[PDB]
Amino acid sequence: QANLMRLKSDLFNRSPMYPGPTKDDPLTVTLGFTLQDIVKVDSSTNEVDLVYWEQQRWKLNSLMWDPNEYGNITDFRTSAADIWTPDITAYESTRPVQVLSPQIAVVTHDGSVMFIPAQRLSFMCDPTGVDSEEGVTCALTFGSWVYSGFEIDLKTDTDQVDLSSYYASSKYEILSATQTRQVQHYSCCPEPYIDVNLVVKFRERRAGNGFF
Amino acid sequence: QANLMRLKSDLFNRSPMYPGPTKDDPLTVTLGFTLQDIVKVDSSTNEVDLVYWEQQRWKLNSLMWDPNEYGNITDFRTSAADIWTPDITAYESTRPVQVLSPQIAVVTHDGSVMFIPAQRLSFMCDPTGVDSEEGVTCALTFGSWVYSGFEIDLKTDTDQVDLSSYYASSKYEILSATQTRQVQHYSCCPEPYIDVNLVVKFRERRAGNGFF
Ligand SMILES: NCCc1c[nH]c2ccc(O)cc12
Ligand SMILES: NCCc1c[nH]c2ccc(O)cc12
Q1: Is the C or the N end of chain B the one with fewer CB within 10 Å?
Q2: A interface mutation test: which of B131, B204, B205, B206 has the most A CBs within 10 A?
Q3: In this structure, are residues B93 and B125 in contact, taking their beta carbons and an 8 Å threshold?
Q4: What does the entry list as the binding residues for Ca(2+) (chains A, B) (predicted)?
Q5: CATH pick for A1-212 out of 3.10.310.10, 3.30.110.40, 1.10.630.10, 2.70.170.10
């Protein structure tokens, strides 16, 4: 498609990239989690491994275009390396994140972006009691590493984690999973930072496939 | 010493031993447990090992004597092999019982007997969930193997298991322990058989010695 080539060239070749948000031009990132699997627990190190898709949305004025000038194109996929992306980080990870999917975003003519990488993460979680009816609860916070709430605000569209793709024959069944916007402070700095608190209650699965 | 030797000779060396209880002459045995330790659980076989002392009391007319005729002796210790003892049996054991104490009874002039052997026993018990706050419940019935309620009846002096000697640094802590008289029927036989149902709720100790 000739029109799309023109669009990408015009967007990505003729100006400096977005330098990120500032106090004068803050940005709100919408977050949502799709929990796919609780893969492994480690009771000797108190780490638990999750597989999830992390849905991120935001909007930049610099990514806008008039579809009329581009054969009525209203959106396109492009490599996430072509655009600015927010530094949303898991605050209690114990290993580097492993990316499980392509990193390609969808950009819409109004400057809005959707980006949903699949990830595996090890995080700090004590799994003692997971083999009981009551199960166990762990929490994981996600937020900008370097930007305070004055530059990056966060939002969820729902407080329910998406479980519609959770692996039915996982070793672990989900009892509940919520995602909630919170405010935190770190020793280094006085300014409020925003996070999303992912809270998952789970236990060893003992009813379903493999069971009779 | 002379009077005791006389008493023992007279009680044990001049008559057939008591042939056990009958319908016409039934016997009631009082049972009580001192739970000392839950030593071990095995989740691959669903066996748990207990150490307890089993208090047994009963009374036989044939063990009576007049203390006046024996230098005021009102009771004596004697090997349990010298007297009839009830066939009180754990019904859900998985290994032969291991005896941890001498087997010696105290006999009193009214023909009553007290016998409290210490035992280790492996029994059928699923310990899944023992490492949680709720812990797990298991039960073990004790009763005559061969006598129905028409020959042997049972009772407890209290429904609360004696925990005053429980090992404070056991891997497992006791949440509750009861001992309750019940009636049972088995496939072999029409008659009711009496048992005491020992019900123990426990979990992995997470406080005290070794824990910070
Ligand atoms: N593959 C499922 C998620 C998904 C659907 N469409 C997408 C577009 C972009 C993206 O990063 C992710 C997605
Ligand atoms: N040694 C604890 C139990 C105990 C105290 N006195 C006893 C007399 C007889 C017996 O079998 C047992 C006992």
Answers
A1: C
A2: B131
A3: no
A4: 164
A5: 2.70.170.10
